[PDB]
Structure 1
């Protein structure tokens, strides 16, 4: 993508999203990041949707194959999909480390990128067989939590999605279901108390993510 204009990459990412061509969408957004300029809010969302969909298909496939696994063919093919998943997570982590996080000074950008760092170390942990990868996810989520608590209101959708994902990290990855349940409860309750401050459209944005926290609390208790 080095020969393509930044604006054309961004335009084609949006076309690829409409076409449900998520591998193309992630390749266009990788090329836009590698132009070296910081991303706007809408561009950071495009980067995240593209990779979420790519890695989401790889995670689903890896879970089907790992279940069948429980000749060498099932293990070889699960290994094949696992390696490709690890490569996509390494690519995202590499964009964050060169140089999205270091250039991100506003809280909205910095928390978004540190949450992504946590997420893609978490996806590495889901397949790992591990301590160091779990620690790297934890450390990224904790830095993002610290900034979000100081800099954003409790209803901010990035803060809420970070706390949701850190709660899933604690329940599924770190074997800390009580920490998961405490974080999801505290986050839901502090957001409920701040909803009165919001417009109708912001209220809809924040209550949609709060419902996910509640859906997990209903699964966990």
Structure 2
């Protein structure tokens, strides 16, 4: 994507999003990040959306295959899918590490990237067969949690989405359903108590995410 203008990559990432062409969207966003400039809020979201969708289809495929797995073909093909997923996670992690996280000074960008780092290590963990990967997820989430708690209101969408994913990590990956539940509940309760400060639009944004915490808690309790 070396020869395409940054702005052109961003414009094409948005078109690919409209076209539900998420692999293209991700390639364009990777090109953009690799221009070496920081991403705006909107660009970070594009990056996240693109790879979430790519890796989301790989995760869904991997789980179908894994379950079938329970001659060598099923294992081979699950390995193939698994390998591709891991390569996607490695390239997201690569982008974070070169050099999105280190140049992210604001709480907004830094928590976003650290959350993302935890997410992609969590995806790696889902297929790992592993403690180091889980610890890399935990550590990235934890650093993101510490900044978000210090630097963002409890209703901030990224703070909420970070806490939601960290709670999922706890439940699904760290075998700590109590930690998962305590986190989701504490997150929801503190957001609830901060809603009064919001405009109607921010209120809608936060409560939409709080409902996922609530749905998880209903699933878990």
Q: Which TM-score tier does this pair reach, normalised by the shorter chain?
A: over 0.9
Tell me the TM-score normalised to structure 1 length.
1.00
2:44 partner SS: helix
1:39 partner SS: coil
- How far apart are 1:99 and its partner, in Å? 0.2
- How far apart are 1:12 and its partner, in Å? 0.3
- How far apart are 1:77 and its partner, in Å? 0.4
Provide Cα deviations, 1:9-52, integer angstroms capped at 9, x if missing partner: 00000000000000000000000000000000000000000000
Q: CA RMSD in A?
A: 0.3
- How far apart are 1:65 and its partner, in Å? 0.4
CA distance in 2, matches of 1:64, 1:192: 37
Residue in 2 aligned with 1:214?
Answer: 214
1:14 partner SS: helix
Runs of 4 or more consecutive aligned structure 1 residues displaced over 2 Å after TM superposition = none
CA distance in 1, matches of 2:20, 2:62: 21
- How far apart are 1:76 and its partner, in Å? 0.4
Residue in 2 aligned with 1:75?
Answer: 75
Provide Cα deviations, 1:150-198, integer angstroms capped at 9, x if missing partner: 0000000000000000000000000000000000000000000010000
Residue in 1 aligned with 2:88?
Answer: 88
Structure 2 spans left out of the alignment, 5+ residues: none
2:20 partner SS: coil
Tell me the TM-score normalised to structure 2 length.
1.00
Structure 1 spans left out of the alignment, 5+ residues: none
Q: How many residues align?
A: 221
